[PDB]
Amino acid sequence: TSILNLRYESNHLIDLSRYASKINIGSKVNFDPIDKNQIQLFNLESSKIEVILKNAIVYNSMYENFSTSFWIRIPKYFNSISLNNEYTIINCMENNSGWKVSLNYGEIIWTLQDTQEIKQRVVFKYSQMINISDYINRWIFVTITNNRLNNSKIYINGRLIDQKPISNLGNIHASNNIMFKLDGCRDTHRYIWIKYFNLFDKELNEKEIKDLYDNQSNSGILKDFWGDYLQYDKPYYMLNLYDPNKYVDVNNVGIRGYMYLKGPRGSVMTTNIYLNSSLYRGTKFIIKKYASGDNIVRNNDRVYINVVVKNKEYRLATNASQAGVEKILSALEIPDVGNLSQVVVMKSKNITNKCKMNLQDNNGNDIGFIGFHQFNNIAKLVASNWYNRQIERSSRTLGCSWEFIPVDDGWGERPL
């Protein structure tokens, strides 16, 4: 379908469309060594990708409909020079006619313009004065569709944000090339992450976009909070969606003690820039391979869970033969787990679900999804098979619904 399909293959970024347009990468473009399709652009002239399109598919019309798709991870704004500093990141403008994706404090912007000095903007706005955002420094799926008889539409994660009229225009003559580059950005330490860039020769409908959202989401590989692949031997701070103003703690190590949800998790704050909930809080987990035989955590991968207390690595375990419905979890010293239950099946989907860790015994029986429960007003981490049971034919948020947060330059909080 695609007239442009920017994809990384072998050791080069290419167009997977028949038009096989030529791509001119700069000296200072970074690729994620784990997913090279994840592209990192800096505020440096050399950090730029240029697509030199074939002259056929070049847009020069007043009635041809088109759409553009991509995923983007936009790090949090840290500085005040970036408030009201709109900066272009993708550009197909030739003599102020064509289109461009631009960014600015709390906004992703789309602009079309014709040969006769008339434009139109659609804008998705997001806040940074917010406890837990869906949009700050997290891979979001942006899709922009255009119909010349009516409107331009801005969809985020499959869902319509805004629509603005473009029937007044206007023959548009776009550039012969697309420039991926931050242009006009006054924040010297600034970047974006970009991946899966597509162009389409029509206005996509609202089902085609949901479908593209669902396939490019890599159902089958667990993700962290930010959207990247979940990894082994990598510390993650833990976020419980059911109760997000609480962080994980251990009162004491050993089958004596318990892991629990402690509150209130605090805030991070830059004056006039952001006020958020703190994400780097409490005991870190590390996902350990059960089978040492690639550090990407995939659906149905049997693992252990390590736990860091006072700088030392422990083990998440429980006795499921204990009396009651929920089996309370403890952080065990590792050479002393014995035959307690500790092996965890990691879950991406069934179908997707935020409920990620299913606790088992050593003979293949479900102990339950790791979550929490209130005992004597102490929200202790437990496993329970109620979780596994509400997950039949529902997809709502539960106390087993978790998010893994590693330290990241886009968030910029002090780790502790």
Place this chain on the structure above:
Amino acid sequence: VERDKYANFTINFTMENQIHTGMEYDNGRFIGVKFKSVTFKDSVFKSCTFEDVTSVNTYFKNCTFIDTVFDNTDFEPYKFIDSEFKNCSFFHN
């Protein structure tokens, strides 16, 4: 460089009756400290930590705090005057 600076230091118990101006405090710890009628003016705090602290008639005027944590402090709005925070974590009073 060309500004007063006092770094890698841990103050353990109590501070009373001092008006500190023009200082940069780089990675300093204030842990278990009681402040009594202490005043920091026109100063900069970088990668420091406030932990289990108490403050009586003390104030931070025209101070920039960078990368610092306030953890179990008694700090209120009316203590920081014409203030600024930058990547500062707030843990609860």
